Design a protein around this nucleic acid. Structure first.
Ligand SMILES: [K+]
Ligand SMILES: [K+]
Ligand SMILES: [K+]
Ligand SMILES: [K+]
Ligand SMILES: [K+]
Ligand SMILES: [K+]
Ligand SMILES: [K+]
Ligand SMILES: [K+]
Ligand SMILES: [K+]
Ligand SMILES: [K+]
Ligand SMILES: [K+]
Ligand SMILES: [K+]
Ligand SMILES: [K+]
Ligand SMILES: [K+]
Ligand SMILES: [K+]
Ligand SMILES: [K+]
Ligand SMILES: [K+]
Ligand SMILES: [K+]
Ligand SMILES: [K+]
Ligand SMILES: [K+]
Ligand SMILES: [K+]
Ligand SMILES: [K+]
Ligand SMILES: [K+]
Ligand SMILES: [K+]
Ligand SMILES: [K+]
Ligand SMILES: [K+]
Ligand SMILES: [K+]
Ligand SMILES: [K+]
Ligand SMILES: [K+]
Ligand SMILES: [K+]
Ligand SMILES: [K+]
Ligand SMILES: [K+]
Ligand SMILES: [K+]
Ligand SMILES: [K+]
Ligand SMILES: [Mg+2]
Ligand SMILES: [Mg+2]
Ligand SMILES: [Mg+2]
Ligand SMILES: [Mg+2]
Ligand SMILES: [Mg+2]
Ligand SMILES: [Mg+2]
Ligand SMILES: [Mg+2]
Ligand SMILES: [Mg+2]
Ligand SMILES: [Mg+2]
Ligand SMILES: [Mg+2]
Ligand SMILES: [Mg+2]
Ligand SMILES: [Mg+2]
Ligand SMILES: [Mg+2]
Ligand SMILES: [Mg+2]
Ligand SMILES: [Mg+2]
Ligand SMILES: [Mg+2]
Ligand SMILES: [Mg+2]
Ligand SMILES: [Mg+2]
Ligand SMILES: [Mg+2]
Ligand SMILES: [Mg+2]
Ligand SMILES: [Mg+2]
Ligand SMILES: [Mg+2]
Ligand SMILES: [Mg+2]
Ligand SMILES: [Mg+2]
Ligand SMILES: [Mg+2]
Ligand SMILES: [Mg+2]
Lengths: 50, 87, 133
RNA sequence: GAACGCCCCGCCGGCGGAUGCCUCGGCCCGGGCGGCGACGAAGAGCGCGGCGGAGCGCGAGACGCGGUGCGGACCCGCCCGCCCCGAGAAGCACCGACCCUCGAACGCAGCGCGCCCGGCGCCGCCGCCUCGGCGCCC
RNA sequence: GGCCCCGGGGGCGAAGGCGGCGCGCAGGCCCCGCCGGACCGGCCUCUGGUGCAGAUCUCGGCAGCAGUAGCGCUACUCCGCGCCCCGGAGGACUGAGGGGGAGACGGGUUCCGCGGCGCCUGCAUCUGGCCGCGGGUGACUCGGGCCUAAGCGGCGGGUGAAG
RNA sequence: CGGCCCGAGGCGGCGGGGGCGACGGGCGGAACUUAAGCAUAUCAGUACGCCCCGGAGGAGAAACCAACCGGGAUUCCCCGUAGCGGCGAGCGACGCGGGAGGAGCCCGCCCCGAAGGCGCGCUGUGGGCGCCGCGAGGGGGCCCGAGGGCCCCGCCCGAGAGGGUGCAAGCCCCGUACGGCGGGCGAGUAGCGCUGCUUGAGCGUGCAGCGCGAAGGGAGGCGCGGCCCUUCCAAGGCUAAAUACGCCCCGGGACCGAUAGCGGACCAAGUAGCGCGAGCGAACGGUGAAAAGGACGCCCGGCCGCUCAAAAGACCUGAACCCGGCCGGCGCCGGCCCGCCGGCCCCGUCUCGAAACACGGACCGAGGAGCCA
């Protein structure tokens, strides 16, 4: 909606910011083979209830 | 038309975010939480669901204060501090 | 036979303690025997390995001698100078084959203020035991 | 007839993940312990790393700060930094502080507003200040 | 739990796997060759979550069928190295209750620029609401904050074993 | 106008509120089920809902039990039938006896009256286990990618519990055994009548509502009235121990070994994902001793080949079902060396009777049902 409360805006803002890949130097640093962050989401198939 | 067509009439929010437990369970029209019971002063807890009890309880969070008090008692100096005071 | 009942003799717990050890325990667990020449001079049997010592290797497929360039405490291994993986090119860099400290014997020790004192601390306790016995 | 199909006289390839061996995990019994909170708990939200998503941890002093002891060469990548008879990396134990919003949750509301220039919630006990009554009397 | 005559068999190759002889009425057992790469037992006594073809059994893999059944909204063509993308020229459509221009609710970054084709775009792709990297929403006058509607709370107290 | 009585607003110091899958205390309170039906009964004074503490809690120093040549507060352990009941199905205490542990006291009333905790009080105060640290003792020869292997000779042992280390280690390394620090006696009561629940309690085991309401009283496992005997003093209060238990830490096991064992062995499980919500809830362990994680060259991804004991190359081993290439051939039993002759309906099941036009079953793997008290 274009008319949203600041409290809903802030919780939506955090899901946008943390929706990221693992950095590549972290993959070298921590010696990882699983490289996908499975807590990511995509707007077409998500149901963020926030 | 009680099936697929009826589902296209949904553009409402029944529940929102609770200020106490954080879940998508606060009824916006009754002003009550269906998870923790807010604005009641006590927490909603039922013995007919022990799985619901283990999901949110003591220990599933930080325990930030209780952790420090126990380690001071078990191996720190707190049991000495009571003897000076309780005299 | 063990008598102390606060000490586990369970394989699962012992293996978990070799991993997940803190860093001060891991350093002690990476010890090696002193040579006979240093055993007479310092009156001590083993020492914890350290970056700067000279070691004589046996029992392995990479026998030799050299200085300790690195300590891989997570692996419980040490990299010695001159003991490398057989390389591909004639130019390319060396690659250290990592050695377990118990396959080594120390020939000369790195010395500083703390290492002199910890030796002397350890001789006086070993003389308490030699007076009790 | 050939080919397709089928059997295997044998030699090789696929697809799949059984069997065997392995185990920082479970389960059972026993012994300890029995230690939260208006001095703001349990729980929730948001934020914090030089390059930083998750989880652990921490709170605008934020991936930690100080003090006493101990320890004595490292700090998973790229860098920084430390290096010495003390100059002090990893690690450990106790102690002193910091401690954003919501929550028993405390000026009202839940994100917007006040009264007053310290501040400003409810109940109860003991005292104290200021008072009411054609209660009993003077 | 025991024994296995200088203290049972093992990298001079354990368990398992694939073929092939033998022994036993049989359940089954033993040996050899190849594979594999670290553990395994014969006899006596003890113990049990101890033997599968079926239960419209449970979970996992997977065949024939089979290159089979199948892929509303009038429509594209020529040239540009040319893709359903872009350009120019032509031919058509939606037909002002619009396949147009904008808000409310819901969604939550889908918006923009540059790059790109591993996934997706049930055909293709050089396209893209897909993937990587940077960015982006400015109010005395617009709305929210204020007022009250239908309602909903609160109120010395009242009631109920309490909630 | 002051005092006392009964109230109101404010201020200061102090206390309360919420939290827990156990154990503990107080209330409300089922139905499935069994009776081969079903109402009383049973399940069960249980599930679940509400309230309240603690490290334990509750209970407790006889208005007790008994019938003896007697015991003597409470709790816990061992031991065993009176009775209740459509007298059906079912249900069910206790004393004596043996042990663990053991501990006893107060207020009211009465006497003295402010002697007290003194802005109060004469409507009565006061007295009668965990923290430190040392820590012994093996070589030589064959062999392997690598010696913890094989052969032959020794040492330590208050230490041959065990973990690590390139392959089975007392003597390669950490530990293990042997030790130091802190250390004069209770009234709307007891009892009784009527009614509801509860108990083995049976003409009443315990509780309660309402009506009535004592003075010496209560009890003695069958009611009422009378006489004795035996034994206690209700209607007020405190109290250690022996007993019970999750979370969390510590040790142990004839337990499970990745479809098992917790739902959860995997840097991110009550997670990802699903539901308006209450709530539901997975799957996924293993390269090698060392990342040494793939040289040089040739064609335009492939070939050749490099590391390594080995590709083990995205990973241990790698079965079945099913499939592709090369090579050979055209269902079970029996005889013969071999494609002829002879015999042969689809199993499991219920059923007098199944090849049945009776039902289940495409195929393959792993799991899968008489155990325990
Ligand atoms: K907007
Ligand atoms: K969406
Ligand atoms: K419909
Ligand atoms: K609600
Ligand atoms: K078909
Ligand atoms: K593009
Ligand atoms: K009441
Ligand atoms: K009941
Ligand atoms: K019932
Ligand atoms: K019935
Ligand atoms: K019944
Ligand atoms: K009955
Ligand atoms: K009944
Ligand atoms: K009956
Ligand atoms: K006793
Ligand atoms: K070694
Ligand atoms: K009375
Ligand atoms: K009465
Ligand atoms: K009864
Ligand atoms: K009776
Ligand atoms: K009455
Ligand atoms: K009698
Ligand atoms: K009786
Ligand atoms: K009687
Ligand atoms: K599971
Ligand atoms: K049947
Ligand atoms: K039948
Ligand atoms: K029949
Ligand atoms: K049949
Ligand atoms: K038939
Ligand atoms: K047939
Ligand atoms: K039949
Ligand atoms: K039929
Ligand atoms: K059939
Ligand atoms: Mg309907
Ligand atoms: Mg509504
Ligand atoms: Mg993070
Ligand atoms: Mg507040
Ligand atoms: Mg078993
Ligand atoms: Mg079985
Ligand atoms: Mg089967
Ligand atoms: Mg037209
Ligand atoms: Mg775009
Ligand atoms: Mg396509
Ligand atoms: Mg205006
Ligand atoms: Mg006050
Ligand atoms: Mg039942
Ligand atoms: Mg019945
Ligand atoms: Mg029946
Ligand atoms: Mg019935
Ligand atoms: Mg009963
Ligand atoms: Mg008590
Ligand atoms: Mg009854
Ligand atoms: Mg009491
Ligand atoms: Mg499992
Ligand atoms: Mg393999
Ligand atoms: Mg029948
Ligand atoms: Mg049938
Ligand atoms: Mg069928
Ligand atoms: Mg099976």
């Amino acid at each position: 909606t274009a008319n949203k409360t600041l409290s809903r805006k802030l919780r939506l803002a955090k899901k946008t910011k943390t929706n990221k890949n693992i950095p590549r130097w972290v993959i070298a640093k921590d010696h990882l083979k699983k490289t996908w962050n499975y807590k990511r989401h995509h707007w077409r198939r998500s149901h963020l209830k926030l | 038309s009680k099936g697929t067509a009826s589902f296209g009439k949904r553009h409402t929010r029944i529940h929102g975010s609770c200020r106490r437990c954080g879940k998508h369970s606060f009824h916006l029209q009754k002003h009550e939480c269906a998870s923790c019971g807010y604005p009641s002063a006590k927490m909603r807890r039922y013995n007919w669901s022990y799985k619901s009890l283990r999901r949110r309880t003591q220990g599933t969070g930080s325990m930030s204060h209780m952790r420090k008090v126990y380690r001071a008692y078990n191996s720190g100096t707190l049991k000495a501090n009571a003897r000076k005071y309780l005299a | 036979m063990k008598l102390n009942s606060a000490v586990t003799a369970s394989r699962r717990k012992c293996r978990k303690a070799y991993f997940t050890a803190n860093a001060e325990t891991r350093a002690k667990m990476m010890s090696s025997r002193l040579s006979k020449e240093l055993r007479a001079e310092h009156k001590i049997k083993t020492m914890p390995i350290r970056r700067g010592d000279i070691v004589e290797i046996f029992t392995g497929g990479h026998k030799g001698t050299g200085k300790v360039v690195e300590v891989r405490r997570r692996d419980y291994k040490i990299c010695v100078e001159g003991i490398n993986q057989k390389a591909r090119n004639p130019e390319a860099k060396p690659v250290p084959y990592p050695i377990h400290p118990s396959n080594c014997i120390i020939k000369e020790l790195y010395m500083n203020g703390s290492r002199y004192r910890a030796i002397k601390r350890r001789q006086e306790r070993n003389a308490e035991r030699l007076a009790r016995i």
